[PDB]
């Protein structure tokens, strides 16, 4: 069980750690989060009480180093930092735990929610979507744009999600215009799965990361990407059977975890109605269809 100590909390801020969140007061003696489960990526995230705009945060994996948070009064944000000196870091944490100045990652044992949301998400894949190679962790925020959004302006600050575009030469084989447009299977299976992602785990990983950035940061381009990756599968007539079953589980937990009061903006009416009710896979998402009907029947 790993720990992310905080130097201090000089400004009042709501701190999230995965799907949990805590309110910390200005100069409250808060010095970090302990008992973080090993084996999964995690995200720590922030929303300042005084500017509820720019949710921001850091994706990390404690297996990859010792990470701590420190507030920067010049740039005005809580920053993640890697500590290279293990004895320093262990001594700092030891002290902080003894003074009981850390909150505990509040995981219920029966609960697989975080695993279910991050099953296919790897740090190494995150770091290719978010390019800042001098760090082992990845910063994301509300305002960052995606490469696709950019094409339609600062490249070093972009979300390099895989570009999906149903009316592109990449998606449409010459001579199979109608076929490929009405059945996206060649674009899913050959172009995307066999060519770019190499396997369905990496595809689901990026789908899951996109959803999490949409939920935690309100990142709109990530929400576009999540929906595009769902639509590409549902709009294919030929999908490996293990993928459809996995997809139904993935989306179920995503819909389960979404704040009830955010359905209006995080859920695209067109995509969901097409996926659950009109697409080839309209009958392959029983768990997702059932939770969506009982929780958000208005959207549909």
């Amino acid at each position: 069980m790993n720990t992310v100590p905080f130097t201090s909390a000089p400004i009042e801020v709501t701190i999230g750690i995965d799907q949990y969140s805590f309110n910390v007061k200005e100069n409250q003696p808060f010095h970090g989060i302990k008992d973080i489960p090993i084996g999964h990526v995690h995200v720590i995230h922030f929303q300042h009480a005084d500017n509820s705009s720019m949710r921001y945060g850091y994706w990390f994996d404690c297996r990859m180093g010792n990470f701590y948070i420190q507030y920067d009064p010049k740039d005005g944000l809580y920053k993640m930092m890697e500590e290279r000196d293990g004895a320093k870091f262990e001594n700092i944490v030891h002290n902080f735990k003894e003074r009981q100045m850390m909150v505990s990652y509040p995981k219920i044992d029966e609960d697989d929610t975080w695993y279910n949301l991050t099953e296919f998400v790897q740090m190494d894949k995150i770091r290719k979507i978010v390019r800042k190679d001098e760090n082992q962790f990845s910063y994301v925020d509300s305002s960052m744009t995606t490469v696709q959004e950019n094409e339609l302006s600062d490249p070093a600050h972009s979300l390099n999600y895989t570009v999906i575009n149903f009316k592109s030469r990449e998606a449409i084989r010459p001579g199979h215009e109608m076929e490929d447009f009405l059945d996206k299977s060649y674009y899913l299976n050959t172009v995307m799965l066999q060519g770019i992602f190499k396997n369905s785990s990496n595809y689901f990983g990026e789908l899951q990361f996109a959803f999490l950035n949409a939920m935690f940061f309100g990142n709109y381009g990530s929400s576009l990407q999540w929906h595009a990756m769902i639509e590409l599968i549902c709009s294919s007539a030929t999908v490996p059977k293990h993928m459809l079953d996995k997809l139904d589980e993935i989306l179920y937990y995503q819909i389960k975890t979404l704040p009830e009061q955010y359905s209006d903006i995080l859920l695209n009416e067109r995509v969901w109605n097409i996926c659950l009710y009109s697409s080839f896979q309209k009958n392959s998402l029983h768990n997702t269809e059932k939770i969506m009907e009982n929780k958000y029947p208005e959207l549909l």
């Binding site: 009316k167 592109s168 030469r169 449409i172 010459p174 215009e177 109608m178 447009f181």
Partner: protein
């Protein structure tokens, strides 16, 4: 964006453009089967592809053999239309290719867009105008060449005959849409108006009668009256 009453003069500027109407591509007669069910029988159709500036008409005849053994024909007809329009553009020299293609029915946008991916600089536009191009098959010589076809065929016409020698493109397009609107609203009466006089004939190389300028005024007025009469019936007003 969409073409409407606001930007109507753009049709007659010097940027090459084409209207594409797919209404008459997939044509059927619905009928009863021996067992009392209903069946369709297809007849030959056509794509109506028209340069409104010059009157050049590219009439691609769609022979019933193209539907043989195919399902969802109304959907296929849109993609066949798009395929043939794309083939037509590819066949034109670069300086003759359109800068814009305006589809009369919005359902043609995605099929034509996908078929035109190799031409990213050609804008595919819908229109808000309710154009009467479905009535193209009320033009006898167009209807005749479509029904007589035994294979896929492209036939070239100038839908304005020689009118551009005396009038502008704007005026010629307005006359065309008036004639077609009249034929669409009451074909029998419109044809009566056009051929009533046996001394006014259609040139072998034309589609419409050889009216003098003053007879065109009379004809045009008769067409507007026919359209108003029909409209008072339609709505009882």
């Amino acid at each position: 964006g969409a073409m409407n009453s606001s930007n109507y003069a753009e049709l007659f500027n010097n940027d090459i453009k084409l209207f594409v109407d797919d209404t008459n591509v997939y044509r059927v007669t619905v009928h009863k089967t021996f067992e009392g069910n209903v069946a369709t029988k297809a007849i030959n159709g056509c794509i109506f592809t028209l340069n409104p500036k010059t009157g050049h008409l590219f009439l691609k005849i769609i022979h019933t053999s193209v539907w043989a053994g195919q399902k969802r024909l109304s959907q296929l007809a849109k993609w066949k239309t798009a395929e043939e329009v794309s083939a037509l553009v590819r066949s034109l020299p670069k300086e003759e290719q359109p800068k814009q293609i305006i589809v009369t029915r919005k359902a043609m946008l995605d099929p034509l867009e996908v078929h035109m991916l190799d031409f990213p600089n050609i804008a595919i536009r819908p229109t808000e105008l309710r154009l009467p191009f479905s009535a193209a098959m009320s033009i006898d010589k167009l209807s005749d060449v479509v029904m007589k076809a035994t294979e896929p065929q492209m036939v070239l016409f100038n839908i304005y005959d020689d009118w551009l020698d005396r009038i502008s493109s704007y005026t010629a397009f307005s006359r065309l849409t008036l004639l077609l609107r009249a034929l669409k609203t009451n074909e029998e009466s419109a044809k009566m108006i056009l051929l009533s006089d046996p001394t006014i004939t259609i040139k072998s190389y034309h589609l419409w009668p050889s009216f003098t300028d003053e007879q065109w005024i009379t004809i045009e007025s008769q067409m507007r009256d026919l359209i108003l009469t029909e409209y008072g019936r339609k709505y009882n007003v």
